[PDB]
Design a protein around this ligand. Structure first.
Ligand code: AMP
Ligand code: ZN
Length: 641
RNA sequence: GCCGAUAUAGCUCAGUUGGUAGAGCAGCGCAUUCGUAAUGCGAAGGUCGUAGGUUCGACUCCUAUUAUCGGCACCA
């Protein structure tokens, strides 16, 4: 066939060739770097034959794809070893994953951190042998036969219920060991030297909490020892960014055994919270919303009417009086509708935008609590928009804009967008869902927002647009969201009066921009690593003296800053100016004002950043204008940087 | 909720070998009045998450429990 290489060059062969064969033909080096090849776009083992013309490319550890191939092979290496150490182990699923791979295994013996260390040792041993990985395509029968005779019940299920009974599934052979799933594998283990097992945990078979929980063993793997070590290094650096840490170090809040999953906001944490509170408010005024507030508990009936009670009563908290059962609200929808139902609304009142910083309480899974990210009590910055279907487009778009508008103040660079389509269990006609799904989609496109569908998610009453942010270790956390609801306002019997003097049920849009205030603070803390932007900073300025001398000057100096609207505390402790500077820089204070005699009756003040950067002595009234400005504009960077 | 692990002073961390819990920092006391990331000396401090149990003896072993860490599942 004729082969066309990355440089347009062509090569002619009179019989089927493999990318490996072609590799040699090109050079002994490239041949030796070969892991796999990319033929006419698809990825195939370097040993697969290329019958007809094709565009070739050799996959090398330089390739992002090689990396994954390598990681996948290590996953097989683990199976190889694991089976030598405890031959009764059943292999389930072992896939590549970000930074590595894992393997779910059914073993009737709880793997201790000692065993996991024994495994990694055996593992490194087999990989050093540098053996060859051999591929062999076969019938869906001998393949089944193979694993049935090997005792692998799981590989069998996958085989007879996930693979076309009329297939030539390829088996991979690592000396005595055999695995069999797609994606190309390594030529020989010479490429699988750098790797390390990490954690281990239970994982349900096939993701169902009703199935058996197997043991999942996680690992990392790279092309070179450098890359691997830089990774582990990155993990360490990441741990110093965790909000639970910084949170404690900076005294932002705490939680206790007696109120699991409920935050106690200490003064400094609450300053941050109240700050986002005014920030949001300023935005609600622009986009023109009303701000209301409803009760914390309401008669359960309201949740029965919407259907929430049936689908979520076990994740809901309730209370009782002699003659009444209440619900501590899980969300603010029903209560806002209650307000809507107050007078008589006409089509002239729409679109009605009603917002609330509402306190939600949900009884989350005990195993799911996570710092400020996943709590049992939180405050949602949500709002519900009551409008006519004609107004949807315009309204949804308004939301989309508001989201990126706000996230841009914090300079987030990774916002991924999802479109959650109808769940299996929902309410509403299939015509309704198409209406809704398409409306969101279109609004997304009309705004040029790339996104992926997420089949199955989406509230029982409507589809959702989910904006998700990431944390220190790149885990996903849903934040802003937009739901299109055509079913609830009717169950809660809400209506306006149309032109024809007829009653119409409004279209309701549920939307939150930050998500929950606790989870957003969770995210900001890790984004700034505790180095909050002057406007969000608990304490903005610390003014210190060097000796009693300057003290009386420092006080009226700090007082001057307070009357100017700057969160400023005065450090007059009898200690070394160096002891102080260390403290507050550690505590992440943005600006530190120093006062030696040279400043006292000299007017000025000695300004320095927390990044470390003497800005030199400057004019009082000037540092004030300068800060009030940094603040007023909620800027990410500080003075002269 | 599930699998595994962890829980020691205000914080960080020993004692994770059954034979009286021990450090640095912080706090307290005295001294030090100092020019941009930690001043010196001193006297003290927990009863080992909680409840049971085994044991001559338990921080160490066992059970139950609560929370937390790492995942899975869940996430209106
Ligand atoms: N348990 C929780 N803890 C903290 N924030 C949450 C929690 N559940 C939901 N959120 C946030 O609130 C938003 C709206 O939640 P939901 O009303 O369930 O759509 C989510 O997108 C998250 O940002
Ligand atoms: Zn809502």
């Amino acid at each position: 066939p004729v082969i066309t290489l990355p440089d347009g060059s062509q090569r002619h062969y009179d019989h089927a060739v493999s990318p490996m064969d072609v590799a040699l033909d090109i050079g002994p080096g490239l041949a030796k770097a070969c892991i796999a090849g990319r033929v006419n776009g698809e990825l195939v083992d370097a040993c697969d034959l290329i019958e007809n013309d094709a565009q070739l490319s050799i996959i090398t550890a330089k390739d992002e794809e090689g990396l994954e191939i390598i990681r996948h092979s290590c996953a097989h290496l683990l199976g190889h070893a694991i089976k030598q150490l405890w031959p009764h182990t059943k292999m389930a699923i072992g896939p590549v994953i970000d930074n590595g791979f894992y393997y779910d295994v059914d073993l009737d013996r709880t793997l201790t951190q000692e065993d996991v260390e024994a495994l990694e040792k055996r593992m490194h041993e087999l990989a050093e042998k540098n053996y060859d990985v051999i591929k062999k395509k076969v019938s869906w029968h001998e393949a089944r036969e193979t694993f049935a005779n090997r005792g692998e019940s799981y590989k069998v299920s996958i085989l007879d219920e996930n693979i076309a009974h009329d297939d030539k599934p390829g088996l991979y052979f690592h000396e005595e060991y055999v695995d069999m799933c797609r994606g190309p594998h390594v030529p020989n283990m010479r490429f699988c030297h750098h790797f390390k097992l990490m954690k281990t945990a239970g994982a349900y078979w096939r993701g169902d909490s009703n199935n058996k929980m197997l043991q999942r063993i996680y690992g990392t793997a790279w092309a070179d020892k450098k890359a691997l070590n830089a990774y582990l290094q990155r993990l360490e650096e990441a741990a110093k960014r965790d909000h639970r840490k910084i949170g404690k170090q900076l005294d932002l809040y705490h939680m206790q055994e007696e109120a699991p999953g409920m935050v106690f906001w200490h003064n400094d944490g609450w300053t941050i919270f109240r700050e986002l509170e005014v920030f949001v408010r300023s935005k609600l005024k622009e986009y023109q919303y009303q701000e209301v507030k409803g009760p914390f508990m309401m008669d359960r009936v309201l949740w029965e009417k919407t259907g929430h009670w049936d689908n979520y009563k076990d994740a809901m908290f309730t209370t009782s009086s002699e003659n009444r059962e209440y619900c501590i609200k899980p969300m603010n929808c029903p209560g806002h509708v209650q307000i809507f139902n107050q007078g008589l609304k006409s089509y002239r009142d729409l679109p009605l935008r009603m917002a609330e910083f509402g306190s939600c309480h949900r009884n989350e899974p005990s195993g799911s609590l996570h710092g400020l990210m996943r709590v049992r009590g939180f405050t949602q910055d949500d709002a519900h928009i009551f409008c006519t279907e004609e107004q949807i487009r315009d309204e949804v778009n308004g939301c989309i804009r508001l989201v990126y508008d706000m996230y841009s103040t914090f300079g987030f660079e990774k916002i991924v967008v999802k479109l959650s389509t109808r769940p299996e269990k929902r309410i509403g006609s299939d015509e309704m869902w198409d209406r809704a799904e398409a409306d969101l989609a279109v609004a997304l496109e009309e705004n040029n927002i790339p996104f992926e569908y997420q089949l199955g998610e989406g509230a029982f009453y409507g589809p959702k647009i989910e904006f998700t942010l990431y944390d220190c270790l790149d885990r996903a956390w849903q934040c802003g969201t937009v739901q299109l609801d055509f079913s609830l306002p009717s169950r809660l019997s809400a209506s306006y009066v149309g032109e024809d003097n007829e009653r119409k049920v409004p279209v309701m849009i549920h939307r939150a921009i930050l998500g929950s205030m606790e989870r957003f603070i969770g995210i900001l803390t890790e984004e700034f690593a505790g180095f909050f932007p002057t406007w969000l900073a608990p304490v903005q300025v610390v003014i210190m003296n060097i000796t009693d001398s300057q003290s009386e000057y420092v006080n009226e100096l700090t007082q001057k800053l307070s009357n100017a609207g700057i969160r400023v505390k005065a450090d007059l402790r009898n200690e070394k100016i160096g002891f102080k500077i260390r403290e507050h820089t550690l505590r992440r204070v943005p600006y530190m004002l120093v006062c030696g005699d040279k400043e006292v009756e000299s007017g000025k003040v000695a300004v320095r950043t927390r990044r470390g950067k003497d800005l030199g002595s400057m004019d009082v009234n000037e540092v004030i204008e300068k800060l009030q400005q940094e603040i007023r504009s909620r800027s990410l960077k500080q003075l002269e940087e």
